[PDB]
Coordinates of C-alpha atoms in Angstrom, one line a residue:
Chain X
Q1 CA 0.0 0.0 0.0
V2 CA 1.5 3.2 1.3
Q3 CA 5.2 4.0 1.4
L4 CA 5.7 7.5 2.8
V5 CA 8.6 8.3 0.6
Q6 CA 11.3 10.1 2.5
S7 CA 14.0 12.5 1.1
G8 CA 17.4 10.8 1.3
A9 CA 20.6 10.9 3.4
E10 CA 23.0 13.8 3.8
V11 CA 25.0 15.5 6.6
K12 CA 24.2 19.0 7.9
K13 CA 26.6 21.3 9.8
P14 CA 26.1 23.4 13.0
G15 CA 24.0 26.5 13.4
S16 CA 22.1 25.9 10.2
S17 CA 18.9 23.9 9.5
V18 CA 18.6 20.3 8.4
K19 CA 16.1 19.8 5.6
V20 CA 14.4 16.4 5.0
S21 CA 11.1 15.5 3.3
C22 CA 8.6 12.7 3.9
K23 CA 7.1 12.9 0.5
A24 CA 3.6 11.9 -0.5
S25 CA 3.3 8.4 -2.0
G26 CA 0.0 8.5 -3.9
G27 CA -2.4 10.3 -1.5
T28 CA -3.0 8.8 1.9
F29 CA -1.5 11.7 3.8
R30 CA -4.4 13.9 5.0
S31 CA -5.3 12.2 8.2
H32 CA -1.8 10.8 8.6
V33 CA -0.5 13.6 10.7
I34 CA 3.1 13.6 9.6
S35 CA 5.1 13.6 12.8
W36 CA 8.8 12.9 12.7
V37 CA 11.1 10.2 14.0
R38 CA 14.8 10.9 14.8
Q39 CA 16.5 7.6 15.8
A40 CA 19.6 8.9 17.7
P41 CA 22.7 7.4 16.1
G42 CA 23.3 4.2 18.0
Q43 CA 22.7 5.3 21.6
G44 CA 18.9 5.5 21.6
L45 CA 15.7 6.3 19.9
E46 CA 14.0 9.7 19.3
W47 CA 11.0 11.6 17.8
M48 CA 11.9 14.6 15.7
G49 CA 8.6 16.2 16.5
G50 CA 6.6 16.6 13.3
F51 CA 3.9 19.1 12.4
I52 CA 0.1 18.7 12.8
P53 CA -1.3 19.8 9.4
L54 CA -4.6 18.1 10.5
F55 CA -6.5 21.4 11.1
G56 CA -4.5 23.0 13.9
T57 CA -1.2 24.0 15.4
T58 CA 2.0 21.8 15.5
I59 CA 3.5 19.7 18.2
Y60 CA 7.2 20.1 18.9
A61 CA 9.7 17.5 19.8
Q62 CA 10.0 16.9 23.6
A63 CA 13.8 16.3 23.2
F64 CA 14.7 19.7 21.8
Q65 CA 11.7 21.8 22.9
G66 CA 11.9 25.3 21.3
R67 CA 13.9 25.3 18.1
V68 CA 12.3 22.3 16.6
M69 CA 10.4 24.3 14.1
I70 CA 8.9 21.2 12.5
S71 CA 6.8 22.3 9.6
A72 CA 5.1 19.9 7.2
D73 CA 3.2 20.8 4.1
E74 CA 1.1 17.8 3.1
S75 CA -0.7 19.2 0.1
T76 CA 2.7 20.1 -1.5
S77 CA 3.6 16.4 -1.3
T78 CA 6.5 17.2 1.1
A79 CA 7.1 16.9 4.8
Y80 CA 9.8 18.7 6.7
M81 CA 11.7 18.5 10.1
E82 CA 12.9 22.1 9.7
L83 CA 15.3 22.0 12.6
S84 CA 16.8 25.4 12.7
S85 CA 19.8 25.7 15.1
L86 CA 21.4 22.3 14.4
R87 CA 24.8 21.7 15.8
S88 CA 26.0 18.1 15.9
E89 CA 23.6 16.2 18.1
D90 CA 21.8 14.8 15.1
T91 CA 24.2 12.1 13.7
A92 CA 21.0 10.1 13.2
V93 CA 18.7 8.3 10.7
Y94 CA 15.6 10.5 11.2
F95 CA 12.6 8.6 9.9
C96 CA 9.3 9.7 8.6
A97 CA 6.5 7.4 10.0
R98 CA 2.8 7.2 10.2
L99 CA 3.3 7.8 13.9
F100 CA 0.5 6.5 16.1
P101 CA -2.2 9.1 15.2
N102 CA -1.7 8.3 11.5
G103 CA -3.9 5.4 10.5
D104 CA -6.2 5.5 7.5
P105 CA -9.6 3.9 7.4
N106 CA -7.9 2.1 4.5
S107 CA -4.6 0.3 5.0
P108 CA -5.3 -1.0 8.6
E109 CA -2.6 -3.6 8.0
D110 CA 0.0 -0.8 7.9
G111 CA -1.6 0.0 11.3
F112 CA -0.4 3.1 13.1
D113 CA 3.1 2.7 11.6
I114 CA 3.8 3.3 8.0
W115 CA 7.5 4.0 8.4
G116 CA 9.8 5.7 6.0
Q117 CA 13.3 5.3 4.7
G118 CA 15.6 7.3 7.0
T119 CA 18.0 10.2 6.7
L120 CA 21.6 10.0 7.9
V121 CA 22.5 13.3 9.3
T122 CA 25.9 14.0 10.9
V123 CA 28.3 16.9 11.2
Chain B
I1 CA -26.9 0.7 37.6
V2 CA -26.2 -2.4 39.5
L3 CA -23.3 -4.6 40.6
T4 CA -23.1 -8.3 41.2
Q5 CA -20.4 -10.0 43.2
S6 CA -21.0 -13.5 41.7
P7 CA -18.8 -15.9 43.7
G8 CA -20.5 -15.0 47.0
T9 CA -18.8 -18.1 48.4
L10 CA -15.7 -18.4 46.3
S11 CA -13.8 -21.3 47.9
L12 CA -10.2 -21.4 46.7
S13 CA -7.5 -22.3 49.2
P14 CA -4.4 -19.9 49.6
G15 CA -1.8 -20.2 46.9
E16 CA -4.1 -20.5 43.9
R17 CA -5.1 -18.0 41.3
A18 CA -8.9 -17.6 41.5
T19 CA -11.6 -15.5 39.7
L20 CA -14.1 -13.3 41.5
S21 CA -16.9 -11.8 39.3
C22 CA -18.4 -8.6 40.7
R23 CA -20.1 -8.3 37.4
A24 CA -21.6 -4.9 36.7
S25 CA -24.6 -4.1 34.5
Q26 CA -23.4 -1.2 32.3
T27 CA -20.2 -0.8 30.3
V28 CA -19.0 1.6 33.0
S29 CA -15.4 2.8 32.7
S30 CA -13.5 1.8 35.9
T31 CA -12.5 5.5 36.1
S32 CA -15.4 5.5 38.5
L33 CA -15.9 1.9 39.5
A34 CA -13.8 0.6 42.3
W35 CA -13.3 -2.0 45.0
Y36 CA -13.5 -1.6 48.8
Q37 CA -12.3 -4.3 51.3
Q38 CA -13.9 -4.6 54.7
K39 CA -12.7 -6.8 57.5
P40 CA -15.5 -9.4 57.8
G41 CA -17.5 -7.1 60.0
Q42 CA -15.7 -3.8 59.8
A43 CA -15.6 -0.6 57.7
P44 CA -14.5 -0.8 54.0
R45 CA -10.9 -0.1 53.2
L46 CA -9.9 1.6 49.9
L47 CA -9.3 -1.7 48.2
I48 CA -9.2 -1.2 44.5
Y49 CA -9.8 2.3 43.1
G50 CA -9.8 1.9 39.4
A51 CA -11.5 -1.5 40.1
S52 CA -8.5 -3.5 38.8
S53 CA -5.8 -1.2 40.2
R54 CA -3.4 -1.9 43.0
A55 CA -2.6 1.0 45.5
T56 CA -0.2 1.2 48.4
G57 CA -1.9 -1.0 50.9
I58 CA -2.7 -3.9 48.6
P59 CA -0.2 -6.7 48.1
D60 CA 0.6 -8.4 44.9
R61 CA -1.3 -11.5 45.9
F62 CA -4.6 -9.7 45.4
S63 CA -5.5 -9.9 41.8
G64 CA -8.4 -8.8 39.6
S65 CA -9.5 -7.3 36.3
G66 CA -12.7 -6.6 34.4
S67 CA -14.8 -4.2 32.2
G68 CA -18.3 -3.8 31.0
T69 CA -20.8 -5.9 33.0
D70 CA -18.6 -8.9 33.8
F71 CA -16.0 -7.6 36.2
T72 CA -13.9 -10.7 37.1
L73 CA -11.6 -10.1 40.1
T74 CA -9.2 -12.8 38.9
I75 CA -7.5 -13.1 42.3
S76 CA -4.0 -14.5 42.3
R77 CA -2.4 -16.8 45.0
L78 CA -4.5 -16.2 48.1
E79 CA -3.9 -15.4 51.8
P80 CA -5.9 -14.8 54.9
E81 CA -4.9 -11.2 54.1
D82 CA -7.1 -11.7 51.1
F83 CA -9.8 -13.3 53.3
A84 CA -11.5 -10.0 54.3
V85 CA -14.8 -8.9 52.7
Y86 CA -14.3 -7.1 49.4
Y87 CA -17.1 -4.8 48.1
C88 CA -16.8 -3.7 44.4
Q89 CA -18.1 -0.2 44.3
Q90 CA -19.5 1.9 41.4
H91 CA -18.6 5.5 41.7
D92 CA -20.7 5.9 38.5
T93 CA -24.4 6.3 38.8
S94 CA -25.5 6.7 42.4
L95 CA -23.1 4.3 44.2
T96 CA -24.5 0.8 44.7
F97 CA -22.0 -1.2 46.7
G98 CA -21.3 -4.9 46.5
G99 CA -22.6 -7.3 49.1
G100 CA -21.2 -10.7 48.2
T101 CA -18.1 -12.4 47.1
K102 CA -15.8 -13.2 49.9
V103 CA -13.0 -15.8 49.4
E104 CA -13.4 -18.7 51.7
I105 CA -11.5 -21.7 53.1
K106 CA -11.7 -25.4 53.7
Chain D
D1 CA 13.5 11.2 28.1
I2 CA 13.4 8.7 31.0
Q3 CA 14.6 6.8 28.0
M4 CA 12.6 3.6 28.7
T5 CA 14.3 0.4 29.9
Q6 CA 12.9 -2.5 31.8
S7 CA 14.9 -4.1 34.7
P8 CA 14.2 -7.3 34.8
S9 CA 15.0 -7.5 31.1
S10 CA 15.1 -11.2 30.2
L11 CA 12.9 -13.1 32.8
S12 CA 12.8 -16.7 31.4
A13 CA 9.8 -18.6 32.6
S14 CA 7.5 -21.4 31.2
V15 CA 3.8 -21.9 31.9
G16 CA 2.7 -20.3 35.1
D17 CA 6.1 -19.9 36.7
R18 CA 5.1 -17.2 39.2
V19 CA 6.0 -14.1 37.2
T20 CA 7.7 -10.8 37.8
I21 CA 8.2 -8.5 34.8
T22 CA 9.0 -4.9 35.7
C23 CA 9.6 -1.9 33.4
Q24 CA 11.7 0.0 35.9
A25 CA 12.8 3.0 33.8
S26 CA 15.8 5.2 34.3
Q27 CA 13.6 7.4 36.6
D28 CA 10.0 7.4 37.8
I29 CA 7.0 7.1 35.5
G30 CA 4.1 7.7 37.9
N31 CA 1.0 6.9 35.9
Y32 CA 2.7 7.2 32.5
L33 CA 3.6 3.5 31.9
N34 CA 2.8 1.4 28.9
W35 CA 3.6 -2.3 29.1
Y36 CA 4.0 -3.8 25.7
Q37 CA 4.2 -7.4 24.3
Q38 CA 4.8 -8.1 20.7
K39 CA 2.9 -10.9 18.9
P40 CA 5.5 -12.4 16.5
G41 CA 4.8 -12.3 12.7
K42 CA 2.4 -9.5 13.3
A43 CA 2.0 -5.9 14.6
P44 CA 2.7 -5.1 18.3
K45 CA 0.1 -5.2 21.0
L46 CA -0.2 -2.7 23.9
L47 CA -1.8 -4.7 26.7
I48 CA -1.6 -2.4 29.7
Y49 CA -1.5 1.4 30.2
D50 CA -0.3 3.2 33.3
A51 CA 0.8 0.5 35.8
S52 CA -2.4 -1.5 35.2
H53 CA -5.8 -1.7 33.6
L54 CA -5.3 -4.1 30.6
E55 CA -6.8 -3.3 27.2
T56 CA -9.9 -5.2 26.1
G57 CA -8.0 -8.0 24.5
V58 CA -4.7 -9.8 25.2
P59 CA -6.3 -11.6 28.1
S60 CA -5.6 -11.2 31.9
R61 CA -2.8 -13.7 31.8
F62 CA -0.4 -10.8 31.1
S63 CA -1.4 -8.7 34.1
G64 CA -0.2 -5.2 34.9
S65 CA 0.7 -4.2 38.4
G66 CA 3.3 -2.2 40.4
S67 CA 3.2 1.5 41.3
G68 CA 6.5 3.2 42.2
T69 CA 9.7 3.3 40.1
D70 CA 9.3 -0.3 39.0
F71 CA 5.9 -1.3 37.5
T72 CA 5.4 -5.1 37.5
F73 CA 3.7 -6.7 34.5
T74 CA 3.4 -10.1 36.2
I75 CA 1.8 -13.1 34.5
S76 CA -0.6 -15.0 36.8
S77 CA -0.8 -18.0 34.4
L78 CA 0.6 -18.1 30.9
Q79 CA 0.1 -20.9 28.4
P80 CA 2.4 -22.1 25.5
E81 CA 1.1 -19.4 23.2
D82 CA 2.1 -16.6 25.6
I83 CA 5.5 -16.5 24.1
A84 CA 5.6 -12.7 23.6
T85 CA 8.6 -10.4 23.9
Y86 CA 8.1 -8.0 26.8
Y87 CA 9.5 -4.7 25.7
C88 CA 7.7 -1.7 27.2
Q89 CA 6.9 1.7 25.6
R90 CA 6.3 4.6 27.9
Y91 CA 3.4 6.9 26.9
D92 CA 4.9 10.2 27.7
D93 CA 2.2 12.8 28.1
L94 CA 3.7 14.5 25.0
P95 CA 4.6 11.7 22.6
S96 CA 8.0 10.2 23.1
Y97 CA 7.4 6.4 22.5
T98 CA 10.5 4.8 24.1
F99 CA 10.0 1.1 23.8
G100 CA 11.9 -1.7 25.4
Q101 CA 14.3 -4.7 25.0
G102 CA 12.1 -7.7 25.3
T103 CA 11.4 -9.8 28.4
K104 CA 10.1 -12.8 26.6
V105 CA 8.1 -15.3 28.8
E106 CA 8.9 -18.7 27.3
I107 CA 7.9 -22.3 27.2
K108 CA 10.3 -25.3 26.9
Chain P
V2 CA -10.7 8.7 61.0
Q3 CA -12.2 7.1 64.1
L4 CA -15.8 8.3 63.4
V5 CA -16.9 7.0 66.8
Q6 CA -20.3 5.2 66.4
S7 CA -22.9 3.8 68.8
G8 CA -23.0 0.0 69.3
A9 CA -25.7 -2.6 70.0
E10 CA -28.4 0.0 69.8
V11 CA -31.6 -1.1 71.5
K12 CA -34.5 0.4 69.7
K13 CA -38.1 -0.9 69.4
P14 CA -40.8 -1.7 66.8
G15 CA -42.2 1.8 66.8
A16 CA -39.3 3.9 68.0
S17 CA -36.9 6.3 66.3
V18 CA -33.1 6.1 66.4
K19 CA -30.3 8.6 67.0
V20 CA -27.2 6.8 65.8
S21 CA -23.9 8.3 67.0
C22 CA -21.1 9.2 64.7
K23 CA -18.4 11.3 66.3
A24 CA -16.9 13.2 63.4
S25 CA -13.3 12.4 64.2
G26 CA -10.0 14.3 64.0
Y27 CA -10.8 15.8 60.6
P28 CA -12.1 19.3 59.9
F29 CA -15.7 18.3 60.2
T30 CA -17.1 21.3 58.3
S31 CA -15.2 20.6 55.1
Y32 CA -16.7 17.2 54.2
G33 CA -19.9 15.2 54.0
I34 CA -20.7 12.0 55.8
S35 CA -22.5 9.3 53.8
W36 CA -24.0 6.1 55.3
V37 CA -24.8 2.6 54.1
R38 CA -27.0 0.0 55.8
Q39 CA -25.3 -3.3 56.2
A40 CA -28.4 -5.4 56.4
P41 CA -27.1 -8.8 57.6
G42 CA -26.0 -10.6 54.4
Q43 CA -27.4 -7.9 52.2
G44 CA -24.1 -6.2 51.5
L45 CA -24.8 -2.6 52.4
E46 CA -28.1 -0.7 51.7
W47 CA -27.5 2.8 50.5
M48 CA -28.5 4.8 53.5
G49 CA -27.8 8.4 52.5
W50 CA -25.4 11.3 53.2
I51 CA -25.1 14.4 55.4
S52 CA -23.1 17.4 54.1
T53 CA -21.1 18.1 57.3
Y54 CA -20.9 21.7 55.8
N55 CA -24.6 22.5 55.2
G56 CA -26.5 19.3 55.8
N57 CA -27.6 18.6 52.2
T58 CA -29.0 15.1 52.4
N59 CA -29.5 12.4 49.8
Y60 CA -31.7 10.0 51.8
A61 CA -32.9 6.5 50.7
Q62 CA -36.4 6.3 49.2
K63 CA -36.6 3.1 51.2
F64 CA -36.3 5.2 54.3
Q65 CA -37.8 8.4 52.9
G66 CA -39.4 9.7 56.1
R67 CA -37.8 7.0 58.1
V68 CA -34.1 8.0 57.7
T69 CA -33.7 11.6 58.5
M70 CA -30.0 12.3 58.8
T71 CA -29.0 14.9 61.3
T72 CA -25.8 15.8 63.1
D73 CA -24.5 17.5 66.3
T74 CA -22.2 19.9 64.4
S75 CA -21.1 21.3 67.8
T76 CA -19.8 18.0 69.3
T77 CA -19.3 16.7 65.8
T78 CA -21.4 13.5 66.4
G79 CA -23.4 12.4 63.4
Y80 CA -27.0 11.3 64.0
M81 CA -28.5 9.4 61.1
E82 CA -32.0 9.2 62.4
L83 CA -34.3 6.3 61.3
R84 CA -37.9 5.9 62.5
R85 CA -39.6 2.7 61.6
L86 CA -37.5 0.4 63.7
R87 CA -38.4 -3.3 64.3
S88 CA -36.8 -6.8 64.5
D89 CA -36.8 -7.0 60.7
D90 CA -35.5 -3.5 60.8
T91 CA -32.7 -4.4 63.3
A92 CA -29.8 -4.1 60.9
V93 CA -26.4 -2.5 61.4
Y94 CA -25.4 0.7 59.5
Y95 CA -22.1 2.6 59.1
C96 CA -20.9 6.1 58.4
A97 CA -18.8 7.1 55.4
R98 CA -17.4 10.5 54.4
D99 CA -19.1 11.0 51.1
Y100 CA -16.4 12.1 48.6
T101 CA -18.4 10.5 45.7
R102 CA -20.9 13.4 46.1
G103 CA -18.3 15.9 47.3
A104 CA -20.0 18.0 49.9
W105 CA -21.0 21.7 49.9
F106 CA -22.8 21.2 46.6
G107 CA -24.6 17.8 46.8
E108 CA -22.7 17.1 43.6
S109 CA -20.7 14.1 42.4
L110 CA -17.0 14.5 43.0
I111 CA -13.9 12.3 42.7
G112 CA -13.2 9.8 45.4
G113 CA -15.3 7.2 47.1
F114 CA -17.3 6.9 50.2
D115 CA -14.4 8.1 52.4
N116 CA -13.4 7.1 55.9
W117 CA -16.0 5.2 57.7
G118 CA -18.0 4.9 60.9
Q119 CA -17.2 2.5 63.7
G120 CA -20.5 0.7 63.3
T121 CA -24.0 1.1 64.6
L122 CA -25.1 -2.5 65.4
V123 CA -28.7 -1.6 65.8
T124 CA -30.3 -4.4 68.0
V125 CA -34.0 -3.8 67.7
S126 CA -34.6 -7.5 68.6
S127 CA -38.1 -8.5 69.4
Chain M
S343 CA 0.2 24.1 49.0
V344 CA -2.0 21.1 48.1
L345 CA -1.2 22.7 44.8
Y346 CA 2.5 21.9 44.9
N347 CA 2.2 18.4 46.1
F348 CA 0.6 16.9 42.9
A349 CA 2.3 14.5 40.5
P350 CA 3.5 15.9 37.1
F351 CA 0.9 18.3 35.8
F352 CA 2.5 18.7 32.3
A353 CA 1.0 22.1 32.7
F354 CA 2.0 23.7 35.9
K355 CA 3.3 26.9 34.2
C356 CA 1.5 29.6 36.2
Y357 CA -0.4 31.5 33.5
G358 CA -0.2 34.7 35.5
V359 CA 1.9 35.6 38.5
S360 CA 4.7 33.1 39.5
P361 CA 3.7 29.5 40.3
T362 CA 4.6 30.4 43.9
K363 CA 2.9 32.9 46.3
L364 CA -0.7 31.8 45.6
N365 CA -1.0 30.1 48.9
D366 CA 0.5 33.2 50.5
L367 CA -1.3 36.0 48.6
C368 CA -4.9 36.7 49.6
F369 CA -7.3 37.3 46.7
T370 CA -11.1 37.1 47.0
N371 CA -11.8 34.2 44.7
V372 CA -9.8 32.7 41.8
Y373 CA -13.0 31.5 40.1
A374 CA -11.8 28.0 39.4
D375 CA -13.1 27.0 36.0
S376 CA -13.7 23.4 35.0
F377 CA -13.9 22.0 31.5
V378 CA -12.6 19.2 29.3
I379 CA -10.6 19.6 26.1
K380 CA -8.2 17.6 23.9
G381 CA -4.6 18.7 23.4
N382 CA -5.0 20.8 20.2
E383 CA -7.5 22.9 22.2
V384 CA -5.4 22.8 25.3
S385 CA -2.6 24.4 23.4
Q386 CA -4.8 27.5 23.1
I387 CA -5.6 27.6 26.8
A388 CA -3.1 30.4 27.8
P389 CA -2.8 34.2 28.0
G390 CA -2.2 35.5 24.6
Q391 CA -1.9 32.2 22.7
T392 CA -5.1 32.5 20.8
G393 CA -5.7 29.4 18.7
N394 CA -8.3 27.1 17.4
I395 CA -10.4 26.8 20.6
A396 CA -9.2 30.1 22.0
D397 CA -10.2 31.2 18.5
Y398 CA -13.7 29.9 18.7
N399 CA -14.5 28.6 22.2
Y400 CA -12.2 29.2 25.2
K401 CA -10.2 32.4 25.4
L402 CA -8.0 33.7 28.1
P403 CA -7.0 37.3 28.9
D404 CA -3.7 39.2 28.7
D405 CA -2.4 37.5 31.9
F406 CA -3.5 36.4 35.4
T407 CA -5.5 33.4 34.4
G408 CA -4.9 32.3 37.9
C409 CA -2.5 29.3 37.5
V410 CA -4.3 27.2 34.9
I411 CA -3.3 23.5 35.4
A412 CA -3.8 21.3 32.4
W413 CA -3.1 17.6 32.1
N414 CA -4.0 14.8 29.7
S415 CA -6.9 12.5 30.8
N416 CA -6.3 9.6 28.4
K417 CA -7.6 6.9 30.7
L418 CA -10.3 9.2 32.0
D419 CA -12.3 10.8 29.2
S420 CA -11.7 8.5 26.2
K421 CA -11.8 4.7 25.7
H422 CA -10.2 3.0 22.7
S423 CA -13.6 3.0 21.1
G424 CA -12.5 6.6 20.3
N425 CA -15.0 8.4 22.6
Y426 CA -17.3 11.0 21.1
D427 CA -18.6 12.4 24.3
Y428 CA -17.9 16.0 25.2
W429 CA -19.3 18.7 22.9
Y430 CA -17.1 21.7 21.9
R431 CA -17.5 24.5 19.4
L432 CA -15.3 24.8 16.4
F433 CA -16.8 27.1 13.8
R434 CA -18.9 28.8 16.6
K435 CA -18.7 32.1 15.0
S436 CA -15.3 33.6 15.6
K437 CA -13.0 34.1 18.6
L438 CA -14.8 35.0 21.8
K439 CA -13.5 37.9 23.8
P440 CA -10.9 37.2 26.5
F441 CA -12.3 35.2 29.5
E442 CA -16.1 35.1 29.2
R443 CA -18.5 32.3 30.2
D444 CA -19.9 30.8 27.0
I445 CA -23.0 28.8 27.8
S446 CA -23.9 31.0 24.9
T447 CA -23.0 28.7 22.0
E448 CA -24.2 31.0 19.3
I449 CA -24.3 29.1 16.0
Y450 CA -22.0 29.8 13.0
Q451 CA -22.4 32.3 10.2
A452 CA -21.5 30.0 7.3
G453 CA -23.1 32.0 4.5
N454 CA -24.5 30.9 1.1
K455 CA -27.9 31.5 2.8
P456 CA -29.8 34.4 4.6
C457 CA -32.3 32.4 6.7
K458 CA -30.2 31.4 9.7
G459 CA -26.7 32.1 8.5
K460 CA -25.7 28.5 8.9
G461 CA -24.6 27.4 5.5
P462 CA -26.4 24.2 4.5
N463 CA -28.3 23.9 7.8
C464 CA -27.2 23.6 11.4
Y465 CA -23.5 24.5 11.4
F466 CA -22.8 22.8 14.7
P467 CA -20.8 24.7 17.3
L468 CA -21.5 21.4 19.0
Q469 CA -18.4 19.3 18.4
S470 CA -18.4 16.1 20.4
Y471 CA -14.7 16.3 21.1
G472 CA -14.3 13.2 19.0
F473 CA -10.9 12.0 19.9
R474 CA -9.0 8.7 20.5
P475 CA -6.4 7.3 22.9
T476 CA -4.5 6.4 19.8
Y477 CA -4.1 10.0 18.5
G478 CA -1.7 12.7 19.6
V479 CA -2.2 14.1 23.0
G480 CA -3.1 17.1 20.9
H481 CA -6.2 14.8 20.6
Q482 CA -5.9 12.8 23.8
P483 CA -8.7 13.5 26.3
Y484 CA -7.9 16.5 28.4
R485 CA -9.6 17.5 31.6
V486 CA -8.2 20.9 32.7
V487 CA -8.5 23.2 35.7
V488 CA -8.5 27.0 35.2
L489 CA -8.3 29.8 37.8

């Protein structure tokens, strides 16, 4: 069914922002609030924070809490993490997922996780 | 809305997982419904607020679960500690207590 | 995060086998504890939410308990099919979803 | 917390009761005392509740005019008063601080029937 | 002080004067408000911070909203049947003015029609909060105390 195509894998350097995109694979994005997975390098897991384009304001990542400017523009067929003020902490494989509030009435087999591909950020 | 402690004379010896139905009538969320233990002839203790939930005073040996109208207090290995009188409450809808299901002995 | 771990992590036990499975995190969880078990060859199953109160489904066998730092997901009585890896997510009141390692309750 | 109650109360078939309930070492005014009737074997019959603040009372239809819950707010001793006593009416009751209907409002609040009466073992034996 | 004791609030940030000194200061009444929400509405419950529900339903003034104490009520207001219980008003008409009481749930001016303003018919400012324990906490049940 649904794939949630994600952008790629590149490194980003301090102070600036890291751009990645969970891209729209053939509809099935509207409910599907595109939150954002981080997956810290090899020490632990994480949730990049995502946006709530489902008719309201956005949730921000608990881990970073203030400069996680996670915007996501679903109609444009692109998601974003939009982490301004990156330094080094990333070094991770930030995934796009159909994070728990993201099931369709279709595709219940891809229930509450339609994961992505992953993006290796580093310094 | 009513409650029904089914095994009024549940006779399972200590050391054996049992099941004690207090068996409500509605589909009540245990957010209200609870359990209250009384010594067999004393005032009810705060036994199980949340109606499945273990607080400070309750040991592990006390077990139970349930939802809807078939609340089964699936008690674990037993003790004389668990041989008081337990009254499953309903904080929902004008509280009707329980009257029945003690756990008994030989 | 409290960066969820469980501590017992690999409690080995067959049918019945008076059980103690506890998702003692780094620090305290209060009433913010999921206890997970994964059904192999399928999608995960969250049985219990904070410290107790099992979902409708995944029967009472896997029984949630414990209120402190360590919350005990003890099994009263499993059966051969209750082979299920006991990792534990922690529903953090803003989503953080830190799952566990897998405290599989076995059979021979 | 102790909620000191009466004991083997000797009433009669055609008398009225003044059950004791010493509102114990809690700030009496900021609560409400519910009651249940432990009819022997019959779990507990829902008696009613006094608002220790104002005296808002949710009696039992069973005991509509019979149970008339009063209290000595001065010496903080609850008097859940039931007329219609008899041998078949000789059944023990208890006190309970009603935190289900949190007091002051006669309105349902969080918590259960809170700390309980000693016990009024009403012996109306005939 | 029975304030300070409580377990994690997840919203203890005193919307108003410092989260201290309330026990000590002596004001007449802090008019404790009581309502349910779900997180996306709870985000709007703050001084300034006008947003979807403090843009149709539940607005707060410049400051001094007592010490509003929000918290998620997952286990308490929604079951995994995806409870549809508590009615709220999105598309009520517009944002209500800071800190009123809105038993007035005036219906929405939705146009394309003169008769009752409501567009097709009955534009509900009656939105059963319609959430799920499997959503975000932006859409988890939320029972919240206001002052």
